Design a protein around this ligand. Structure first.
Ligand SMILES: *CC(=O)c1cccc(NP(=O)(Oc2ccccc2)Oc2ccccc2)c1
Ligand SMILES: *CC(=O)c1cccc(NP(=O)(Oc2ccccc2)Oc2ccccc2)c1
Lengths: 306, 306
């Protein structure tokens, strides 16, 4: 029993984290095989905020202008190239700790673990979600860029996020590991702001199923809803539309608990319309939307506490 | 910016996790140097619930009745002893991945990371606190006992918790790494229940300071309180008494924000008496008490967003 915001064990990623320095700029990089991946921001100077031209900035650099430090070992850079908003530094040594890995570009509503790092040293691990507006609500201080986000599946690390920047609302923006930003953001000092965000409906429903699996049914009711009428309510509360595909995805949790998906939708509609009246669910007084259906199945028992 | 329930990076502990089997009972163990630590429950049989006599159960075992599996390598047990509610199995191989480590018995209100494991394989990492009633609100399924809790400080892992059992309210009980339970619990199938719990006042205050550091002052007021009058309110709301030592401990956060501790106490008193009125703090609609003052200082910037 119990339900926590749980991250993947971070060891396989810890062994990949390095420090990259170009001139006076230092940040984190990810060392896999003989390549180090890092934000291309590392070639920026103190003046290059407004409109840096990265191609122009990079042609002015040589391999030896890049310093890569892996623990107490300096790695020699033997090639460099830029791919979208990431730099790839070929080093003369393959990381002996490279895990089995993949690079994945995730959809909004998907969750992942973040290993926050400073100067190539991991500091903490936490779970977050790609928001519908393609920001993440992370916890990052200066020096954290190049920290990565990941999922682990049968010992294969799927990297999905590299941290670049903090927007004015305190939320975070970054790229996949091929350097393409999530969302409309660009790596330049221009007015950029998070777009209006929405609540991830399919994840709220998954977490209501987690609450039931764990033994709690207070918020359930005798009603059902059509998918159309639910989505009318959802739209009113700034929730994302629920698709038939989402309903399909919630199938296994529905079957484990015996609660039809559209019946849980009627539960959620009542919760939106009436609030919680001072009660909690899984120890929260708000509806939680940063657990996917897969996350619930992974963490919860396969046997419901009936 | 941002504030998350952050765990320590778990790699140094992952490399220590093994599987221990005695007869038909299997659970997790912790391999440090040439010793494996595990719950003494591993020598229990299917019938030994009510009142097992562990000394009697153990004298009936030999070294070879214990099977220790570390990845795909079997470790040979060459000695065994029991210390309180843990077993120590001397193996013929020192763990080459042993980190610098210590064993610590923590006070209630202290936090730590848990690496949940099954069959010696880590599954997830999360943060929790030793509650005042000496349970933890973990996330554990069958097979998780022997999973450990830990803090990391300058590459030294301080182990503080080994998981044993789940109580009827779904909260969790376990030992320090020398096998002494936290709380009054015993490892036998007898009616045992969590005692009434309280909210960890000094941690709530730390988290209010985190909210201010991150840029949010809505809940502040122009009032102060004496420590005595605050504790009268605290006692009324099932909060723990605040001591002058706690006030001292909150000194650095007070100094970083310019908010005297007793002024933050007046804030908290108002929040208890009036509720939040639909507002949130650091994205929570409840007052959070599983961040220590040390946790806040570690995660937050050293510069307040004024
Ligand atoms: C650390 C890192 O990798 C990084 C990546 C992108 C952007 C930034 N900092 P920022 O202030 O923008 C730049 C400044 C100078 C040179 C290039 C980019 O990020 C930012 C934040 C909010 C709005 C606009 C830009 C660091
Ligand atoms: C897995 C493990 O290490 C462990 C440690 C202590 C207790 C248990 N299970 P439990 O049902 O009690 C025992 C059963 C059989 C033999 C010995 C102990 O735990 C428990 C839970 C709630 C009330 C009382 C006991 C597993």
């Amino acid at each position: 029993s119990g339900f926590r915001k749980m991250a993947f064990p971070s060891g396989k990623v810890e062994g990949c984290m390095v420090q990259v320095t170009c001139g006076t700029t230092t940040l984190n990089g990810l060392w896999l095989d003989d390549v180090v991946y890092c934000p291309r921001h590392v070639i920026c100077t103190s003046e290059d905020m407004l409109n840096p031209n990265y191609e122009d900035l990079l042609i002015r650099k040589s391999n030896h202008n890049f310093l890569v430090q892996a623990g107490n070992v300096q790695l020699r850079v033997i090639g460099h190239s830029m791919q979208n908003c990431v730099l790839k530094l070929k080093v003369d040594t393959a990381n002996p700790k490279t895990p089995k890995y993949k690079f994945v570009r995730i959809q909004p509503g998907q969750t992942f673990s973040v290993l926050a790092c400073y100067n190539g040293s991991p500091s903490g691990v936490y779970q977050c979600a790609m928001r519908p507006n393609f920001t993440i609500k992370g916890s990052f201080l200066n020096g954290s860029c190049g920290s990565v986000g990941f999922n682990i599946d049968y010992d294969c690390v799927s990297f999905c996020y590299m941290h670049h920047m903090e927007l004015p609302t305190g939320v975070h923006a970054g790229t996949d590991l091929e350097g393409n930003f999530y969302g409309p953001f660009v790596d330049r000092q221009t007015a950029q702001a998070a777009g209006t965000d929405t609540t991830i409906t399919v994840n709220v429903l998954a977490w209501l199923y987690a609450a039931v699996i764990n033994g709690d049914r207070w918020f359930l009711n005798r009603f059902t809803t059509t998918l159309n009428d639910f989505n009318l309510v959802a739209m009113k509360y700034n929730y994302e539309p629920l698709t038939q595909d989402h309903v399909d995805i919630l199938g296994p949790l529905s079957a484990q608990t015996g609660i039809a998906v559209l019946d849980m939708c009627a539960s959620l509609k009542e919760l939106l319309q009436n609030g919680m009246n001072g009660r909690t669910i899984l120890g929260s007084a708000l509806l939680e939307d940063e657990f996917t259906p897969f996350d619930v199945v992974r963490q919860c028992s396969g046997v419901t506490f009936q």
